[PDB]
Design an enzyme around this catalytic site. Structure first.
Site, PDB file in Angstrom:
ATOM      1  N   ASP A  68     -62.176  -3.255 -17.336  1.00  0.00           N
ATOM      2  CA  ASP A  68     -61.175  -2.910 -18.339  1.00  0.00           C
ATOM      3  C   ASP A  68     -59.828  -3.494 -17.901  1.00  0.00           C
ATOM      4  O   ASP A  68     -59.720  -4.091 -16.814  1.00  0.00           O
ATOM      5  CB  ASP A  68     -61.111  -1.381 -18.553  1.00  0.00           C
ATOM      6  CG  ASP A  68     -60.589  -0.590 -17.354  1.00  0.00           C
ATOM      7  OD1 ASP A  68     -59.367  -0.433 -17.240  1.00  0.00           O
ATOM      8  OD2 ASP A  68     -61.416  -0.120 -16.530  1.00  0.00           O
TER       9      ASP A  68
ATOM     10  N   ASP B  69     -63.461   6.724 -14.839  1.00  0.00           N
ATOM     11  CA  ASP B  69     -63.385   6.602 -16.304  1.00  0.00           C
ATOM     12  C   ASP B  69     -64.532   5.760 -16.925  1.00  0.00           C
ATOM     13  O   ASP B  69     -64.315   4.934 -17.827  1.00  0.00           O
ATOM     14  CB  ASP B  69     -61.982   6.157 -16.773  1.00  0.00           C
ATOM     15  CG  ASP B  69     -61.650   6.377 -18.258  1.00  0.00           C
ATOM     16  OD1 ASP B  69     -62.398   7.129 -18.942  1.00  0.00           O
ATOM     17  OD2 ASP B  69     -60.684   5.746 -18.750  1.00  0.00           O
TER      18      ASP B  69
ATOM     19  N   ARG C 178     -66.107   2.078 -23.702  1.00  0.00           N
ATOM     20  CA  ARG C 178     -64.815   1.408 -23.971  1.00  0.00           C
ATOM     21  C   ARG C 178     -64.335   0.647 -22.709  1.00  0.00           C
ATOM     22  O   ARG C 178     -63.522  -0.269 -22.807  1.00  0.00           O
ATOM     23  CB  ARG C 178     -63.738   2.441 -24.407  1.00  0.00           C
ATOM     24  CG  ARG C 178     -63.353   3.449 -23.304  1.00  0.00           C
ATOM     25  CD  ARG C 178     -62.404   4.553 -23.742  1.00  0.00           C
ATOM     26  NE  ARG C 178     -62.354   5.593 -22.705  1.00  0.00           N
ATOM     27  CZ  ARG C 178     -63.103   6.685 -22.676  1.00  0.00           C
ATOM     28  NH1 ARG C 178     -63.969   6.927 -23.657  1.00  0.00           N
ATOM     29  NH2 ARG C 178     -62.999   7.543 -21.684  1.00  0.00           N
ATOM     30  N   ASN C 179     -64.833   1.060 -21.531  1.00  0.00           N
ATOM     31  CA  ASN C 179     -64.482   0.479 -20.240  1.00  0.00           C
ATOM     32  C   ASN C 179     -65.564  -0.490 -19.686  1.00  0.00           C
ATOM     33  O   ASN C 179     -65.629  -0.760 -18.480  1.00  0.00           O
ATOM     34  CB  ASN C 179     -64.068   1.588 -19.254  1.00  0.00           C
ATOM     35  CG  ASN C 179     -62.745   2.204 -19.621  1.00  0.00           C
ATOM     36  OD1 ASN C 179     -61.882   1.541 -20.179  1.00  0.00           O
ATOM     37  ND2 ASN C 179     -62.557   3.489 -19.343  1.00  0.00           N
TER      38      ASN C 179
END
Ligand SMILES: Cc1cc(NC(=O)c2ccc(Cl)cc2Cl)n(-c2ccccc2)n1
Length: 300
Positions: free
Chosen positions: A176, A158, A162-163
């Site tokens: 994360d 992933d 955002r991570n």
């Protein structure tokens, strides 16, 4: 951690082993300050931790009371997170398993997630802007974290801005709290998959490899150079899936020099074996971060 890279590595690596000896932190030494985020199975807080290194800031993940299997998963994840130690991987300090809620303690990354950071430091700033040299330094640091993970044969699954997290003095690290599916639900398509960051073999077979991670890194580069814009933002999930499998490529961002677009393209080869290695991608980005391209420069 359903579908996490942490669990996927433990399940798949036949040479992996770990005893239960993670660092334990006394509950009385953790003093919560305020909430940073919330998800379906947990909450993240900013906290002060005493007797850890004196009184220092940490990010604390609290688990919403868990089943026996969720507590067993928490332990498996904690052992692996103890092992992931790199300058561009978020530091894990340990756990608190005496009493409840079960806690995981991480270093505090003061500028929050990289997607929020890019959006708040770019055009039409989401409430100063990052220069090309800074964008390349951000890219080179995420690339360094990926070199380390590939060296361990660890598939992220992933990779996206955002991570990633941003700390003091533009430090960027991969990390994360396992809640991006709740916080950034529009970045997944329902088992929720980050299709916009995924190569064709991942969409077709749910096949996640070091080469699918390289493709996702190419998508991260495009996110960085557009200041946090969502890949294929004009399209629905089904139209995005068709673009990906049919060979449509994301357009060169306005802030992206042609030599950097060439790097994204090397990550985006539809045949996995043809994608550039993360080691090579990192070396070119590090060289560019220290000698950024100049528009209309005399090259010879
Ligand atoms: C669903 C999901 C995804 C993740 N994140 C990762 O697996 C992850 C974290 C860190 C790093 Cl460096 C690499 C990776 Cl791939 N979690 C998670 C579970 C427990 C704790 C923190 C996250 N849960």
């Amino acid at each position: 951690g359903k579908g996490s890279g942490l669990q996927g590595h433990i399940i798949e690596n036949p040479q992996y082993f770990s005893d239960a000896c993670v660092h334990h932190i006394k509950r009385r030494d953790i003093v919560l300050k305020w909430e940073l985020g919330e998800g379906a199975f947990g909450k993240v807080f900013l906290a002060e931790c005493h007797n850890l290194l004196d009184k220092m800031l940490v990010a604390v993940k609290a688990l919403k009371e868990a089943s026996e299997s969720a507590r067993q998963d928490f332990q498996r994840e904690a052992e692996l997170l103890t092992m992931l130690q790199h300058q561009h991987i978020v530091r894990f300090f340990g756990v608190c398993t005496e009493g409840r809620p079960l806690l995981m303690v991480f270093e505090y990354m003061r500028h929050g997630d990289l997607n929020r950071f890019l959006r708040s430091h770019g055009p039409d700033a989401k409430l100063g802007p990052l220069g090309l040299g800074q964008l390349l330094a951000v890219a080179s640091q995420v690339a360094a974290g990926m070199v380390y993970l590939a060296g361990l044969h660890f598939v992220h699954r992933d990779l996206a801005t955002r991570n990633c997290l941003v700390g003091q003095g533009l430090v960027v690290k991969i990390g994360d709290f396992g809640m991006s599916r709740d916080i950034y639900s529009t970045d997944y398509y329902r088992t929720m998959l980050p299709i916009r960051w995924m190569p064709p073999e991942s969409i077709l077979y749910r096949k996640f490899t070091t080469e699918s991670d390289v493709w996702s890194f190419g998508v991260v580069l495009w996110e960085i150079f557009t200041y946090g814009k969502q890949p294929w933002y004009q399209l629905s999930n089904t139209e995005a899936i068709d673009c990906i499998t049919q060979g449509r490529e994301l357009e060169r961002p306005r802030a992206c020099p042609p030599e950097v677009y060439a790097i994204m393209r090397g990550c985006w080869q539809r045949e996995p074996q043809q994608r550039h290695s993360i080691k090579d991608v990192h070396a070119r980005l590090q060289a560019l971060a220290q000698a950024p391209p100049v528009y209309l420069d005399v090259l010879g």
